[PDB]
Scaffold this active site. Structure first.
Site, PDB file in Angstrom:
ATOM      1  N   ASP A 109       0.819  -1.199   0.000  1.00  0.00           N
ATOM      2  CA  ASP A 109       0.000   0.000   0.000  1.00  0.00           C
ATOM      3  C   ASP A 109       0.857   1.255   0.000  1.00  0.00           C
ATOM      4  OD1 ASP A 109      -2.587   1.378   2.209  1.00  0.00           O
ATOM      5  OD2 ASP A 109      -1.769   2.020   0.268  1.00  0.00           O
ATOM      6  N   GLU A 116      27.446  14.153   9.387  1.00  0.00           N
ATOM      7  CA  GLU A 116      27.972  14.070  10.750  1.00  0.00           C
ATOM      8  C   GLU A 116      26.798  13.875  11.717  1.00  0.00           C
ATOM      9  OE1 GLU A 116      31.791  17.171  10.193  1.00  0.00           O
ATOM     10  OE2 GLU A 116      29.961  17.845  11.246  1.00  0.00           O
ATOM     11  N   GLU A 134      24.545  13.291  14.805  1.00  0.00           N
ATOM     12  CA  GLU A 134      24.716  13.388  16.253  1.00  0.00           C
ATOM     13  C   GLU A 134      23.461  12.772  16.860  1.00  0.00           C
ATOM     14  OE1 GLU A 134      25.146  17.613  17.131  1.00  0.00           O
ATOM     15  OE2 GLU A 134      27.285  17.542  16.618  1.00  0.00           O
ATOM     16  N   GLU A 175      30.156  13.942  21.789  1.00  0.00           N
ATOM     17  CA  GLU A 175      29.800  15.335  21.556  1.00  0.00           C
ATOM     18  C   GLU A 175      29.845  16.228  22.782  1.00  0.00           C
ATOM     19  OE1 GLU A 175      30.122  16.714  18.009  1.00  0.00           O
ATOM     20  OE2 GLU A 175      28.926  17.894  19.428  1.00  0.00           O
ATOM     21  N   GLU A 211      28.639  11.118  18.300  1.00  0.00           N
ATOM     22  CA  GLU A 211      28.714  11.375  16.879  1.00  0.00           C
ATOM     23  C   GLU A 211      29.570  10.336  16.179  1.00  0.00           C
ATOM     24  OE1 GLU A 211      30.540  14.762  13.811  1.00  0.00           O
ATOM     25  OE2 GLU A 211      29.238  15.254  15.521  1.00  0.00           O
ATOM     26  N   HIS A 246      25.312  17.709  10.458  1.00  0.00           N
ATOM     27  CA  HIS A 246      26.043  18.537   9.489  1.00  0.00           C
ATOM     28  C   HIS A 246      26.259  17.789   8.181  1.00  0.00           C
ATOM     29  CE1 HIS A 246      28.147  21.164  12.825  1.00  0.00           C
ATOM     30  NE2 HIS A 246      26.841  21.072  12.985  1.00  0.00           N
ATOM     31  N   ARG A 281      32.233  31.149  15.205  1.00  0.00           N
ATOM     32  CA  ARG A 281      31.517  30.534  16.302  1.00  0.00           C
ATOM     33  C   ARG A 281      30.500  29.490  15.881  1.00  0.00           C
ATOM     34  NH1 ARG A 281      30.848  33.221  21.958  1.00  0.00           N
ATOM     35  NH2 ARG A 281      32.916  34.203  22.155  1.00  0.00           N
ATOM     36  N   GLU A 337      30.293  22.840   3.923  1.00  0.00           N
ATOM     37  CA  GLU A 337      29.501  22.250   4.992  1.00  0.00           C
ATOM     38  C   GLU A 337      28.290  23.088   5.351  1.00  0.00           C
ATOM     39  OE1 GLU A 337      30.908  22.089   9.387  1.00  0.00           O
ATOM     40  OE2 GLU A 337      30.508  19.955   9.090  1.00  0.00           O
ATOM     41  N   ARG A 353      25.690  23.397   8.168  1.00  0.00           N
ATOM     42  CA  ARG A 353      25.482  22.996   9.546  1.00  0.00           C
ATOM     43  C   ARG A 353      24.066  23.148  10.080  1.00  0.00           C
ATOM     44  NH1 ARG A 353      27.317  25.806  12.937  1.00  0.00           N
ATOM     45  NH2 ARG A 353      28.249  24.315  14.426  1.00  0.00           N
TER      46      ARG A 353
HETATM   47  N1  LIG Z   1      -4.591   0.114   5.965  1.00  0.00           N
HETATM   48  C1  LIG Z   1      -5.431  -0.827   6.388  1.00  0.00           C
HETATM   49  O1  LIG Z   1      -5.713  -1.816   5.716  1.00  0.00           O
HETATM   50  C2  LIG Z   1      -6.056  -0.612   7.733  1.00  0.00           C
HETATM   51  C3  LIG Z   1      -7.133  -1.631   8.057  1.00  0.00           C
HETATM   52  C4  LIG Z   1      -7.732  -1.405   9.442  1.00  0.00           C
HETATM   53  N2  LIG Z   1      -6.761  -1.870  10.487  1.00  0.00           N
HETATM   54  C5  LIG Z   1      -9.149  -1.985   9.475  1.00  0.00           C
HETATM   55  O2  LIG Z   1      -9.814  -1.871  10.519  1.00  0.00           O
HETATM   56  O3  LIG Z   1      -9.590  -2.525   8.442  1.00  0.00           O
HETATM   57  N1  LIG Z   2      30.120  19.975  15.749  1.00  0.00           N
HETATM   58  C1  LIG Z   2      29.639  20.311  16.944  1.00  0.00           C
HETATM   59  O1  LIG Z   2      30.334  20.822  17.822  1.00  0.00           O
HETATM   60  C2  LIG Z   2      28.175  20.061  17.194  1.00  0.00           C
HETATM   61  C3  LIG Z   2      27.439  21.341  17.468  1.00  0.00           C
HETATM   62  C4  LIG Z   2      25.975  21.150  17.869  1.00  0.00           C
HETATM   63  N2  LIG Z   2      25.751  19.756  18.342  1.00  0.00           N
HETATM   64  C5  LIG Z   2      25.054  21.517  16.707  1.00  0.00           C
HETATM   65  O2  LIG Z   2      23.871  21.778  16.996  1.00  0.00           O
HETATM   66  O3  LIG Z   2      25.500  21.554  15.536  1.00  0.00           O
HETATM   67 MG   LIG Z   3      30.920  19.818  11.644  1.00  0.00          MG
HETATM   68 MG   LIG Z   4      29.704  17.609  15.920  1.00  0.00          MG
END
Ligand SMILES: NC(=O)CC[C@H](N)C(=O)O
Ligand SMILES: NC(=O)CC[C@H](N)C(=O)O
Ligand SMILES: [Mg+2]
Ligand SMILES: [Mg+2]
Ligand SMILES: NC(=O)CC[C@H](N)C(=O)O
Ligand SMILES: [Mg+2]
Ligand SMILES: [Mg+2]
Ligand SMILES: [Mg+2]
Ligand SMILES: [Mg+2]
Lengths: 443, 443, 443
Positions: free
Chosen positions: C52, C131, C133, C188, C195, C244, C315, C332, C334
């Site tokens: 399906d 990358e 995480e 990390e 990571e 990243h 930064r 890259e 990020r």
């Molecule tokens: N995608 C499906 O076939 C769902 C069937 C559903 N579980 C029902 O009551 O028939």
């Molecule tokens: N490379 C890293 O220092 C990770 C930074 C931090 N985890 C982010 O949100 O990207």
């Molecule tokens: Mg990086």
């Molecule tokens: Mg990292």
């Protein structure tokens, strides 16, 4: 003749079988059984093993009546999980009267009576591809089932990661050893719900596999600390479980439902079938959905049939015609659920179809339209009738329909209604918590 | 004119009232209310106090519509339990449209419309002697009601010994101060069930007292650490609570139901009444038993009506004619329950009776026979029809009956059905624990 | 190529594979699949196995529609952890319509399409070095996740000793047996954060791995009594997770980004690529950060991109250009996170980049100073814009962009916005504890 008296004897010995289960099905679709030690195999294969046949009518028994078990050498199977010294083997039997005549009360025989009725019209085979769905719940400290689901998966997700144990996976593997021709399985819409689809199979055989399936599903599940259930609607608000039935008629060994020239590549015989099903749909629902709870599933918004109509692509039609054509052309009936007695369910479904073919009933117009939005006004303006809302309602409809009634036979019919009427009455006089939470303080 | 504008003003002042409750009833029989400080009494008695009248249609509201409250100087009462500085007084009001015309949606007015219909036939009064029953449950640590009954008394037993506190007793005493003319009370069949019978009273007044009764019963009960409930069937297996209605028609000030010369000393008018009630019984049940649970009470074996029939002495007839004659000759309707909206309940009951009197309908034959044993076969062989088994069933019957429908009016009818249909639908799609205990593992 | 139908045939026969997972990916980046027994392998390889296809749209499914699965012989892998008795193999398949045509809604397909526009403009390959995480939480008694982290390690610390159990090590080890080429892995910034970086690979190879990685990780993590989550921002006040993406365009087999003698050693094509990503950043942010929670990660003070700017050292630049050059010369991005659907995120990022190349867009001046200190006003003075603050903002932004909308295709686009719009709506109408902690008493 898959197996022979000697093929069976050689196997039981070589595979060191020590316990044989002579199984059968009662009026409620429940898997019955009379077990004997391997030392009795001979008497079993001789059709001499007696049992109280009143156990076939279920909880409506009134008197003890001796009957015979006639094992079907073809249904011979061995349970892999049972191991070592105590290997168990099974034999789905047929019930016969003391005199030697088949028991009318036996649902499996009923399907045979109707299949014979099929051959008298010119058809050779009547295959059925079931789509049984179920839920798996966790087990508490003791061993009683809880309302906790085994997972949080969605429709066709990669449920329980292979590592460790995965019920659905481990079920399929056991079914293969026994000799099952499974098409494929996946995770269902609601969390904790699973589906294992079978391959095309003859009515009786296909129905026999449905019974065994539930047995293998329930057993293996318990072995994984889980609880398998084929209850139509276990939880309010979440999807319910249904057992779609992909039917298909054959003549001389060819799919009598295919016609590479007519609209949708469907033949006149196929459409007549569609008509028969539509004419009796609301009448046989009591059989394809035997329990009270079966109607809590037939509620809009959960992809479950609620109106009598057929389409090739729709939200949730009663009858659906799969894409596949040729030998795969088939008519899917989506109203049927896992709680339905397979043997009875097919009998009534075959009788409905054959009625339309025999009387050349005109098939309604397809409906790729939307029944979900249009109120009852349009449903009335169109040939859209609703299915019975309650078991009671469905039972009143079933009785009126003559072809459906004669589809089960005097003995079967009589008891089916007696059992359900009581069932319903038990439910209608019950006071549910919901009732007090709504009235206890409001009044 | 029990009280006058000045009689009311003198009382509020002398009795030092500081809080006035302008109460009314919605479509579901629920006791509504709009409270104001004594400083507003003047504006109240002037009929200027506005409120959202859409609150009369219940949970089916769709828009806010300003309306007036017209206090009934006769319904003026003071709540004794409320004491000291904060004394509370009430005024059952009538709802009027902004233009000055009575609101059709108001059930209390509906009863007036039908009573007027009574006077147009030559009748002066239509008294009603109610027999409201209820259950008292204990309250848990917090304050939520439990399933524990306040006692273990039986039918007419000497429940809770006078010493200490006795709800039933203390209720009657409060009702007397307010000015109730109680006939008598006793302990009911089931443990923890009580009954306080009122005295004869005019429709509207009697219905107004039923509303106040529930209020006094619920309040005082909570003050004793108990929970009062008028739910038809709180517990499965134990007796349910009903609200028998002893009706009686008058002409020129005399009991038009008495005839010291005809059989059973009943008049032709009385029997015509009986006929009207029998003809519409199954049609007005949706009104006299509005909730789903109301039909769990209408189950055989609990001294509650289950078939349309009348007698003078029987197990549990629908219509019963009390022994008392003369001015006391009355027709008791036992199907009605405490969950019924008194104003609507009487309207439909009056319309049924008057229909038979106006059209001189022939009254069926009494039945001192036993409906309990004789199956539906005899019930069919006789004019014994069953009452609707479910709210759904009763709602379908109510709509078909034309006199019953016109008995509630366009506006009232429309909403009543809308509210109940939703109510029912909510219940039918619900999955009750009972369903899982019966199927969860059986399937 | 890598495998032939015979290579697979022999492998499954020698490796005693019993279960075959035909996996794919829905619109929400969720890993899905249809499981079939090894006995169905032939039908699988024959592209005859159906399912399906509406399952691709996720919770926005409306109508069930048959579709085919075309296994990619090259994505064949055998999960090591699976027990010898039940070896499991997988196949990342492609979705096709009943008529043999590529389903436009298939996400993996869309990436293939966008890659064609890359080949048309004259480019050989488009590599991706992600990358990923993720955080690891502890499992309570019922295997339920908890806020408890798996360790108190820091950035690049030698998290968890070489004790008997060490998830990260065990993950990388299991991936080695599966033919996964990992560059390196570390712990990390936030405790319990890890990571694992993969070696660069083709757009599709890379994405397919990002999917397989999530599966293996979560799987092995559950085997250690832990719970793996790629949720962009699990806990408040702690670092979020970001996947990243190191993008690298190839032309004629060489790095079209590197330029021996050029400013910063970045060719012209490289610069245009940078520009292509800058003008489209705010628009494609809804795809690379598809959840509500994603934007809680996109906040200053946690090394997560909050403005559209590129640099070699800063930064938290949205676009960073690592040191290494030559065929290692890459760009890259990020802002992307692990909740993003790899196939869709790469399609939107490749589209933006190709927009800048084909239209010779000029790259802005690289920001080498602290953007955190520059007030909202200051960032305005220079080419500095903020990324969408909430999902809702990101969405409207996405619709405003045409090249981005065409990057997903009408079909994929329609459903993406649908899913996300109802998704956000749920969040928007939700009432969180925080709100109550801040207004319950203050107001
Ligand atoms: N995608 C499906 O076939 C769902 C069937 C559903 N579980 C029902 O009551 O028939
Ligand atoms: N490379 C890293 O220092 C990770 C930074 C931090 N985890 C982010 O949100 O990207
Ligand atoms: Mg990086
Ligand atoms: Mg990292
Ligand atoms: N004796 C009685 O009147 C019992 C009445 C009973 N409680 C009922 O349901 O009507
Ligand atoms: Mg299904
Ligand atoms: Mg199906
Ligand atoms: Mg009584
Ligand atoms: Mg009485």
């Amino acid at each position: 003749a898959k197996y022979t008296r000697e093929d069976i004897e050689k196997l039981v010995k070589e595979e060191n079988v020590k316990y044989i289960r002579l199984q059968f099905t009662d009026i409620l679709g429940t898997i019955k059984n009379v077990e004997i030690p391997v030392s009795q195999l001979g008497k079993a294969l001789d059709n001499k093993v007696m049992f109280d046949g009143s156990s076939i009518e279920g909880f409506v028994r009134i008197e003890e009546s001796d009957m015979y078990l006639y094992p079907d050498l073809n249904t011979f199977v061995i349970f892999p999980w049972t191991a070592e010294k105590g290997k168990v083997a099974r034999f789905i039997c047929d019930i016969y009267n003391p005199d030697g005549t088949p028991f009318e009360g036996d649902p499996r025989n009923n399907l045979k009576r109707i299949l014979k009725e099929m051959e008298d019209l010119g058809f050779s085979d009547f295959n059925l591809g079931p789509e049984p769905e179920f839920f798996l719940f966790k087990l508490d400290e003791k061993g009683e089932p809880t309302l906790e689901l085994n997972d949080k998966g969605g429709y066709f997700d990669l449920a329980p990661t292979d590592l460790g144990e995965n019920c659905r996976r481990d079920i399929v593997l056991e079914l293969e050893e026994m000799g099952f021709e499974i098409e494929a399985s996946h995770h269902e819409v609601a969390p904790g719900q699973h589906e294992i689809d079978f391959k095309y199979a003859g009515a009786v055989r296909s129905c026999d596999d449905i019974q065994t399936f539930k047995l293998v599903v329930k057993t293996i599940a318990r072995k994984h600390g889980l609880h398998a259930t084929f209850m139509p609607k276990p939880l309010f608000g979440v999807n319910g479980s249904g057992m779609h039935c992909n039917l298909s008629l054959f003549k001389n060994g060819v799919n009598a439902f295919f016609d590479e020239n007519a609209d949708l590549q469907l033949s006149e015989t196929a459409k007549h079938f569609i008509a028969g099903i539509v004419k009796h749909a609301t009448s046989f629902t009591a059989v394809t959905n035997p329990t009270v709870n079966s109607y809590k599933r037939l509620v809009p918004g959960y992809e479950a049939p609620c109106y009598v109509a057929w389409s090739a692509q729709n939200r949730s039609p009663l009858i659906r015609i799969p894409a596949s054509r040729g030998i795969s052309t088939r008519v899917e009936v989506r109203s049927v659920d896992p709680a339905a007695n397979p043997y009875l369910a097919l009998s009534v479904l075959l009788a409905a179809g054959l009625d339309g073919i025999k009387n050349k009933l005109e098939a309604p117009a397809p409906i790729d339209r939307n029944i979900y939005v249009m109120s009852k006004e349009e449903r009335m303006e169109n040939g859209i009738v609703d299915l019975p809302a309650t078991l009671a309602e469905a039972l009143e409809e079933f009785k009126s329909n003559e072809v459906m009634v004669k589809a089960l036979g005097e003995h079967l019919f009589e008891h089916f209604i007696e059992a359900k009427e009581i069932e319903w009455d038990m439910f209608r006089t019950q006071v549910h918590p919901w009732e007090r939470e709504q009235y206890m303080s409001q009044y």
